[PDB]
A paper describes a structure:
To understand the molecular basis underlying the superbinding characteristics of the Legionella SH2 domains, we determined the structures of L. longbeachae LeSH and the L. pneumophila RavO SH2 domain in complex with tyrosine-phosphorylated peptides by X-ray crystallography. Compared to the Src SH2 domain, LeSH is missing two β-strands (βA and βF) but contains a 45-residue insert between the strand βE and the helix αB. This extra sequence in LeSH contains a structural motif called the pancreatic polypeptide (PP)-fold, comprising an amphipathic α-helix (named herein as αEF) packed against a polyproline segment via favorable hydrophobic contacts. Indeed, the SH2 and PP folds together form a clamp-like structure that grasp the pTyr residue.
We obtained crystal structures of LeSH in complex with three different pTyr ligands, including the phosphotyrosine itself, a 13-mer peptide derived from the pTyr381 site of DnaJ-A1, and another 13-mer peptide corresponding to the pTyr387 site in IL2Rβ. Apart from the pTyr residue, which assumed the same conformation in all three complexes, we were not able to detect the electron density for residues preceding the pTyr in the DnaJ-A1 peptide or any residues flanking the pTyr in the IL2Rβ peptide despite the high resolution (1.6–1.7 Å) of the complex structures obtained. This suggests that, in contrary to their important role in binding to a mammalian SH2 domain, residues C-terminal to the pTyr may not make a significant contribution in binding to a Legionella SH2 domain. Of note, the positive charge on LeSH extends well beyond the pTyr-binding pocket due to the presence of a Lys-rich face in the αEF helix. The expansive positive electrostatic potential explains the general (i.e., position-independent) preference for acidic residues by LeSH beyond the pTyr. However, the R46K mutant of LeSH bound the DnaJ-A1 and IL2βR peptides that contain multiple Asp/Glu residues markedly better than to the remaining peptides that contain fewer acidic residues. This indicates that charge–charge interaction plays a pivotal role in the LeSH-peptide ligand interaction.
Author numbering: 11 to 167
The structure:
């Protein structure tokens, strides 16, 4: 009857309110966090938390590698209509780099995500959370109706 610790596809309003309900804004950054299915890249996990320094919710994507869960490539900063030609020229190169790196990353991650759950992938998720200095006691756990239904997470309990 155990519920996975991974959220399913939840919306941005719900993410903010879950963090606020668990008092993320009166605790250090990463003291409170949640883990959810990525809404952009199936097979990836996204860690959402509150960044005290910027007063915003931030997100970090993880995917399976041969070594276990690792951080995915991160995208360059979004275009701003105030951008100069220099910013936009750099963005072109950085976006191509991101897309190439993310395409390779997802192709490997999806294959591993699809493969049989010998379950020892779960330990590597905890390791990467520790390396990122997420307070594991601050993990927000989903309710049954909000938990991920991905078969890979059935024993992520």
């Amino acid at each position: 009857s155990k519920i996975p610790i991974i959220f399913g596809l939840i919306n941005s309003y719900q993410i903010h309110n879950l963090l606020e309900q668990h008092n993320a804004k009166t605790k250090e950054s990463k003291a409170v966090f949640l883990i959810r299915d990525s809404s952009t890249y199936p097979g990836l996990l996204t860690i959402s938390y509150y960044c005290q320094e910027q007063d915003i919710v931030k997100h970090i994507r993880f995917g399976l590698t041969d070594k276990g869960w690792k951080t995915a490539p991160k995208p360059p900063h979004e275009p701003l209509k105030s951008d100069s030609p220099e910013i936009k020229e750099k963005y072109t190169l950085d976006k191509i780099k991101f897309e190439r790196k993310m395409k390779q990353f997802i192709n490997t991650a999806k294959k591993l995500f699809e493969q049989h759950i010998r379950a020892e992938s779960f330990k590597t998720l905890i390791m990467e959370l520790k390396i990122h200095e997420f307070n594991l006691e601050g993990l927000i756990k989903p309710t049954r109706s909000q938990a991920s239904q991905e078969k890979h997470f059935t024993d992520y309990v």
